[PDB]
Amino acid sequence: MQQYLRLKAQHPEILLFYRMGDFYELFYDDAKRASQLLDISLTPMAGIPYHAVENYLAKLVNQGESVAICERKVVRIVTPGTISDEALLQERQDNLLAAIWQDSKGFGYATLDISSGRFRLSEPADRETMAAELQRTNPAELLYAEDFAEMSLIEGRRGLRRRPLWEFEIDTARQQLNLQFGTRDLVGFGVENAPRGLCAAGCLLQYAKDTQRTTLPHIRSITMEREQDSIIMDAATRRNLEITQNLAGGAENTLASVLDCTVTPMGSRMLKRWLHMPVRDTRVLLERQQTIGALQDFTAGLQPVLRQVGDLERILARLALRTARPRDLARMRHAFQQLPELRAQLETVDSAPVQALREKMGEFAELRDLLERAIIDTPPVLVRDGGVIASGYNEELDEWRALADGATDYLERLEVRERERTGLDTLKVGFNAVHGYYIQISRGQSHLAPINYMRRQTLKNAERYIIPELKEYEDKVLTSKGKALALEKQLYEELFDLLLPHLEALQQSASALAELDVLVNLAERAYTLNYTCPTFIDKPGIRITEGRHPVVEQVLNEPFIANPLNLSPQRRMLIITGPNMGGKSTYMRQTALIALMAYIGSYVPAQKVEIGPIDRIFTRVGTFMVEMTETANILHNATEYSLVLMDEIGRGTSTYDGLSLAWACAENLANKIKALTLFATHYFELTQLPEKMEGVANVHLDALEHGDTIAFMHSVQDGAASKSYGLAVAALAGVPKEVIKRARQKLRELESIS
Amino acid sequence: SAIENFDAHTPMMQQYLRLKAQHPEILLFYRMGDFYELFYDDAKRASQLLDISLTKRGASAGEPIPMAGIPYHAVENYLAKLVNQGESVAICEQIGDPATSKGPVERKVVRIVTPGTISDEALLQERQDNLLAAIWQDSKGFGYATLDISSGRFRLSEPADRETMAAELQRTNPAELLYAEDFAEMSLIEGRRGLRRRPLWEFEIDTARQQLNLQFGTRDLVGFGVENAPRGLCAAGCLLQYAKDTQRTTLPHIRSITMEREQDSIIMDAATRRNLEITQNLAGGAENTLASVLDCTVTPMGSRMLKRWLHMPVRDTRVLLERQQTIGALQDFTAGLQPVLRQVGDLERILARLALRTARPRDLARMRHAFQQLPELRAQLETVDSAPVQALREKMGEFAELRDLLERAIIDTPPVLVRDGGVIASGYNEELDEWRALADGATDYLERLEVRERERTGLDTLKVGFNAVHGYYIQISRGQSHLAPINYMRRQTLKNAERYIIPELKEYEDKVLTSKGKALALEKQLYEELFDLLLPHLEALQQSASALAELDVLVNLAERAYTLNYTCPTFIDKPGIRITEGRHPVVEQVLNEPFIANPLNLSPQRRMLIITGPNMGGKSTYMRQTALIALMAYIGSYVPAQKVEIGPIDRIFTRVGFMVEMTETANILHNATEYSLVLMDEIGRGTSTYDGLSLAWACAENLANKIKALTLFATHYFELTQLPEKMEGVANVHLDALEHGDTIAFMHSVQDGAASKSYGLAVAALAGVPKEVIKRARQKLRELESIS
DNA sequence: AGCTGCCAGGCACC
DNA sequence: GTGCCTTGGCAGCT
Ligand SMILES: Nc1ncnc2c1ncn2[C@@H]1O[C@H](COP(=O)(O)OP(=O)(O)O)[C@@H](O)[C@H]1O
Numbered sequence A: 001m002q003q004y005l006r007l008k009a010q011h012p013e014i015l016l017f018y019r020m021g022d023f024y025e026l027f028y029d030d031a032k033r034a035s036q037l038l039d040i041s042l043t044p045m046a047g048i049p050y051h052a053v054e055n056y057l058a059k060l061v062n063q064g065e066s067v068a069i070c071e072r073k074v075v076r077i078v079t080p081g082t083i084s085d086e087a088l089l090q091e092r093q094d095n096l097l098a099a100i101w102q103d104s105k106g107f108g109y110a111t112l113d114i115s116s117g118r119f120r121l122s123e124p125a126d127r128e129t130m131a132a133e134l135q136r137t138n139p140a141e142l143l144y145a146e147d148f149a150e151m152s153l154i155e156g157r158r159g160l161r162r163r164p165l166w167e168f169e170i171d172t173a174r175q176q177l178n179l180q181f182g183t184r185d186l187v188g189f190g191v192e193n194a195p196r197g198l199c200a201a202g203c204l205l206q207y208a209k210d211t212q213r214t215t216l217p218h219i220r221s222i223t224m225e226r227e228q229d230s231i232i233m234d235a236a237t238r239r240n241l242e243i244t245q246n247l248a249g250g251a252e253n254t255l256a257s258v259l260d261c262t263v264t265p266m267g268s269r270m271l272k273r274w275l276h277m278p279v280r281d282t283r284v285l286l287e288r289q290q291t292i293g294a295l296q297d298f299t300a301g302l303q304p305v306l307r308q309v310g311d312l313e314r315i316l317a318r319l320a321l322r323t324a325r326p327r328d329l330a331r332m333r334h335a336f337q338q339l340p341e342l343r344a345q346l347e348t349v350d351s352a353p354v355q356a357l358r359e360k361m362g363e364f365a366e367l368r369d370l371l372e373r374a375i376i377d378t379p380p381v382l383v384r385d386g387g388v389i390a391s392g393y394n395e396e397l398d399e400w401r402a403l404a405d406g407a408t409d410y411l412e413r414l415e416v417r418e419r420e421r422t423g424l425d426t427l428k429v430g431f432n433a434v435h436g437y438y439i440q441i442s443r444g445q446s447h448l449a450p451i452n453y454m455r456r457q458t459l460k461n462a463e464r465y466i467i468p469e470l471k472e473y474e475d476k477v478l479t480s481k482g483k484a485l486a487l488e489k490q491l492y493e494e495l496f497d498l499l500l501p502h503l504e505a506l507q508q509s510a511s512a513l514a515e516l517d518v519l520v521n522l523a524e525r526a527y528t529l530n531y532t533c534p535t536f537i538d539k540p541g542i543r544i545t546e547g548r549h550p551v552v553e554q555v556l557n558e559p560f561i562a563n564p565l566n567l568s569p570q571r572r573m574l575i576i577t578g579p580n581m582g583g584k585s586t587y588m589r590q591t592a593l594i595a596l597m598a599y600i601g602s603y604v605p606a607q608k609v610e611i612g613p614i615d616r617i618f619t620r621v622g623t624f625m626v627e628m629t630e631t632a633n634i635l636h637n638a639t640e641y642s643l644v645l646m647d648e649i650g651r652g653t654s655t656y657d658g659l660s661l662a663w664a665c666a667e668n669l670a671n672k673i674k675a676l677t678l679f680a681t682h683y684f685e686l687t688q689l690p691e692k693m694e695g696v697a698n699v700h701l702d703a704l705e706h707g708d709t710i711a712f713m714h715s716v717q718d719g720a721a722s723k724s725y726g727l728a729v730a731a732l733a734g735v736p737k738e739v740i741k742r743a744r745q746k747l748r749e750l751e752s753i754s
Numbered sequence B: 001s002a003i004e005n006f007d008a009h010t011p012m013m014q015q016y017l018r019l020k021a022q023h024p025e026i027l028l029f030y031r032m033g034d035f036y037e038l039f040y041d042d043a044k045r046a047s048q049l050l051d052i053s054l055t056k057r058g059a060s061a062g063e064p065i066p067m068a069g070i071p072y073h074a075v076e077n078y079l080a081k082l083v084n085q086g087e088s089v090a091i092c093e094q095i096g097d098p099a100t101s102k103g104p105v106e107r108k109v110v111r112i113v114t115p116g117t118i119s120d121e122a123l124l125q126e127r128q129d130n131l132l133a134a135i136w137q138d139s140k141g142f143g144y145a146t147l148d149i150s151s152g153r154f155r156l157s158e159p160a161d162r163e164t165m166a167a168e169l170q171r172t173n174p175a176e177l178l179y180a181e182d183f184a185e186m187s188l189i190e191g192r193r194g195l196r197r198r199p200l201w202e203f204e205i206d207t208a209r210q211q212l213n214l215q216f217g218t219r220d221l222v223g224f225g226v227e228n229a230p231r232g233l234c235a236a237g238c239l240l241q242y243a244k245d246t247q248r249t250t251l252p253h254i255r256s257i258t259m260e261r262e263q264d265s266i267i268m269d270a271a272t273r274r275n276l277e278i279t280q281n282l283a284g285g286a287e288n289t290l291a292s293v294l295d296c297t298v299t300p301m302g303s304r305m306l307k308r309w310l311h312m313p314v315r316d317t318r319v320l321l322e323r324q325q326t327i328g329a330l331q332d333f334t335a336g337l338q339p340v341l342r343q344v345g346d347l348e349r350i351l352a353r354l355a356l357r358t359a360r361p362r363d364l365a366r367m368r369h370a371f372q373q374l375p376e377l378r379a380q381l382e383t384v385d386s387a388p389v390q391a392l393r394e395k396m397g398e399f400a401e402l403r404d405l406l407e408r409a410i411i412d413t414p415p416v417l418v419r420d421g422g423v424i425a426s427g428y429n430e431e432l433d434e435w436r437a438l439a440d441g442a443t444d445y446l447e448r449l450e451v452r453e454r455e456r457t458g459l460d461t462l463k464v465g466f467n468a469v470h471g472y473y474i475q476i477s478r479g480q481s482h483l484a485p486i487n488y489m490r491r492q493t494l495k496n497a498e499r500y501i502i503p504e505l506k507e508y509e510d511k512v513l514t515s516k517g518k519a520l521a522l523e524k525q526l527y528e529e530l531f532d533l534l535l536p537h538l539e540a541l542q543q544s545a546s547a548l549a550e551l552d553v554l555v556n557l558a559e560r561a562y563t564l565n566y567t568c569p570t571f572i573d574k575p576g577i578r579i580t581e582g583r584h585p586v587v588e589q590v591l592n593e594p595f596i597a598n599p600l601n602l603s604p605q606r607r608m609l610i611i612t613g614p615n616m617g618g619k620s621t622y623m624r625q626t627a628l629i630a631l632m633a634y635i636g637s638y639v640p641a642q643k644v645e646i647g648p649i650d651r652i653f654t655r656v657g658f659m660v661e662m663t664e665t666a667n668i669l670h671n672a673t674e675y676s677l678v679l680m681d682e683i684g685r686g687t688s689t690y691d692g693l694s695l696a697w698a699c700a701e702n703l704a705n706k707i708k709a710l711t712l713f714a715t716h717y718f719e720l721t722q723l724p725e726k727m728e729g730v731a732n733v734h735l736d737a738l739e740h741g742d743t744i745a746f747m748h749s750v751q752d753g754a755a756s757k758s759y760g761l762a763v764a765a766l767a768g769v770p771k772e773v774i775k776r777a778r779q780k781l782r783e784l785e786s787i788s
Numbered sequence C: 001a002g003c004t005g006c007c008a009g010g011c012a013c014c
Numbered sequence D: 001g002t003g004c005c006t007t008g009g010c011a012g013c014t
């Protein structure tokens, strides 16, 4: 046990699994942390069983831990961002490697999805935009230059990896990026004039390659994510809208929960991506809109077939890495068989892009016929033990099998020859690695074992023998079965050689199939959930009719209530007064969301939506300090094409400081920024604003008082709120009648003064 | 779908289905030979829960039988897994003797492991209580009972309202909760772990009394002062009935019950406990809580007690003074006692296993070891001049006789279990010394017979060996196996060697095996004999463990008082709190800068402080420390300040800033009295400007003028600084700030009077709100300031 | 030292 | 009097 320490040197910053029998023990500083992650005991030992390493691996890997197995030297290493095995990955969630680094000018960024090969790079200018990306992409592993200054950005992130500065040298990166894609220059990818980003990308690429020690011919390109291309959404806005992850960490009662009725895992992952990346370019959208409406009818017929395609993206990765297993080629073939049925259905769909996805989807006939002949219906998990290549694929194999089988058949009749020529009904042939083939007599019966029988193993209640004949046909079995196992593997490896030259076209199929899933889904959702198609206008504005919060309406078993909205440049800002109770917050969020969805190509929960160009979405809807910091970022960055949602700011400090801060903020967003604003507030004094400045208007929520409770409504109406309900609720909440009456007195006296 | 009427099943599955029908909701481990097995549904679940194979074993009444199992020897790993996910398991054992059992061997469920009744070292946590509990509801209140099965501690109580009941669940935090079937307030109990719905009949009062009396050996419950408390007794009844059915043995360590009266201790509510971070930080960890800072006990049974104390402050002026006196006398003796007190270990829980006849060999060895530290504890404490200390030196006994029993009965370091022997020592039982010796002829015998047979046969590969399946043997290699004596009877064959047996050896096989088993049965008989010798003293032993735990706690609090610099507070007759240079006992450690200590004078004439101050000024911390100083004072501990005078305090309320705030606040208005300490922390929420301020006003008014509680009222509303003007008993304090220059500065120092101003704009400016906007908010502020 | 597979002891069934 | 079967232990082969 002294050979562990000297070989920990090899990899210091990584957990070292070490083999001791049927477990993988861990020592020293590494056991404390490994028991503190996986729920096991520390003795400084700690270890796991062999037929479950791949869970106590997938689970350290989930928490940003690279791992290193040790069998004698380090044989396997995994890292959070570089895995591609279906056991280690979560079915419907991206898993990225990222690299980040820092010039004096600003930041360079690069994400890799090792499975899809989806390789993106960006170049955030300021602090908070680098922060917004770290949020959105959620790298499972973060490479960062040692010299990286602003660590408060990535300080507590899981699976951080400090790397030398020289891995972010521009010309080493350029070469290696160009060698990877097979080009002279990266101009065809739109990135040659973007050196910061390319550094991030060169370092990342460098490292991926290392973790794999193979080519990665699925990584054939790179794209850059320009700022002006997307509607920008700060981390806080992403979180408040609950796009994929609800505020409480989970994933239900979220926008994706409602909108994500895709059937392939690769399509779930793509939908979620789109949802986090609304694009400002109406082109791509207007085209998405029209695709989505075309497949309205063809939904029922398409999805159940599309479901059979499966996760063809991730399978295509294990083909590239050459790790793909029997069941993976089997799932690849099953998908090819779907392609013709799908092609038949998209034939009629009159939409130039739907027809493009059918072209891009491919058919792949050779390959479908190839694996139809070369694999059985349902092979076993691994090639390891043969029985995967179908009978009739290759004369030679079949011959070697028929040989083995005729030795099995002999040995069965030998079981019946000896049973007859002994009169002993517990006789039987068996197989075992210890002894090879063997006859076996029960213990009570074993003394009548014929004199030619040679004994070999005394068991508790039986005895085992061998004879020249028996051993001679073992020879026959072992020979055949073994030669034919070696053939299956060679035959199976050749299936890789024939499949790989079409890797390019296949990636394109999975991707076309992936988009087809998403759009077919968005089409079904649009139809089922009574969404309408939003139209786009030139000036900034949001005109909604009977619109809704897409999640709240699916979740609550009370009726939703639909509200209008009418923001234009002549009506930029609504001062929303009245009680809150979620109602005001909902009216706002359904706005952010209806816009988000519009600007993703989806249909929207409303009788009608007109909408202008939006560049950022801000949603302070959630210390006083946080509130003000968030409010600061909004005032510093809103343009007049921003959508800005603000929730009773002022609460938390003094009547007058807050009244004043809120007044000063509304003035600023309405006269200076001129951004389209919903300004929830409680200050009644703010309702004078419409008189004191153009382009502000008053709207409100109200409540009905019946019986023994109070109906907090959901319905926005013109003008200011002429009532308050805090005392109303104090009453229903059990506060002594006399106290309430004293508060009511205090109320009429404080208000009267204003 | 098959009809599975009794007589369609096999004799075995009949026996199973009968026992299983007595445990329909919980897994049944079913001893079948060497394996605990599980069938149907149970197997399906067990398979999912414990990750084990789901298989089949021969249909019974037409349909096949799902099956899952685990060998008997690995049962406790799996009992651990299940108990940790709040699952009960009924253990069914074999009672009979299959060699004289015609049908299936008799089978009785002998125990039931449930999360509130575990008493094994490996299933529990050393520094953390594990309570069973029962709750039930009357038309007019709440009955409630708790057992700590591994010490016998058995309390009962009767909370008057929803919020006190919510306080009591939070405080006690039962791993398991039996609750009556007709319980109304599922808000309290839904979503707790180990929830157990029980039928009304178990909470019937005459039955509770019957059982409880019978367990305690009494005609009535008058001497436990609970004969008065049928609301709570009904809980006890249902608790006990349950314990008995889990354990299925006597429970001699459950000898009394004790009421927890409302007046006997400072009642704090959900909010207050959460917000004082007594044992749980505000995220859920234990890092940096009261208990983290104060808990340097050396035994686990002591760490647990300090935590019950911290959680239930006592209002007995006499218990408190005796406690302070102890922390005083013992201050010099902490360095010597603690290293000795540590070796006592967790005797509390050992005596639990002793009560249940469960204790293992290493349990008795550590009981012996504890006994061995008593004479040195009696020395160290004799010289200490303090009667309370001397009554603990007294109560902790010495136990010279039982110590000499374990020293003669058991070897120094025995194995974990009795099941293989090697526990009882030489000299204790002469019949065992005799049986051991006949069994250990190996010292040179099999070696001698081996060597003499190798020379007689001339067959160098000849070895003697035992293998568990075929007994002893003489082995010969296959090269030489045809040359072996004709006398050698072939016994076991192998690939390259052939083992034989002869009379001389088969006879030594028998001499050895019957004697080894005779010696194990007798040893197991001697071991269980230890329990009957010890058990008679169980009561005086329990009183010892308690003594040593309390000593651990006090010796601790003494050391804590020295190293952290605390002073004995004094108590007074009327309500009031008077702190000179006092600190938050916790936050003055996590901080790597000196803690700005602060004063406080609360009296019946100066009983509400409106507390203003900027955000992050130190307001919440000022209130938190006030309650922790009151909290520590009322456990007998020394306190984090220079001087403290504190009056009686019945209850502590906390509100920290919808329909929930309103209710919480109403509870404070209904149950607060002159003797309560109330912390409103920035309350008052409305749907308009002056909505919520109005309520805070009326609430502050009502608290000052009608309730007359002691009150720390932190506030953002400057409107409330006018309260002293109008209200009697109300005064303004503030946490100082220096805008002075352009920046902030939090001086963290409480001062008299209203604050100079609110700092909202300055704090907004510090957040990075653009200057042009702060400039215009100020233009607006001077607008609003001009009204008055 | 590593991998394979008999064995533990109940009871049902032929 | 052989059948059948969980999991963990370690014997019996390399
Ligand atoms: N007496 C003090 N001395 C030094 N630091 C303090 C003191 N009181 C509070 N603080 C620090 O200031 C922080 C914020 O204090 P806090 O009580 O929350 O102010 P407020 O409640 O008014 O918002 C605390 O977490 C603590 O670290």
Ligand SMILES: [Mg+2]
Pocket: B619, B620, B621
């Ligand atoms: Mg505070």
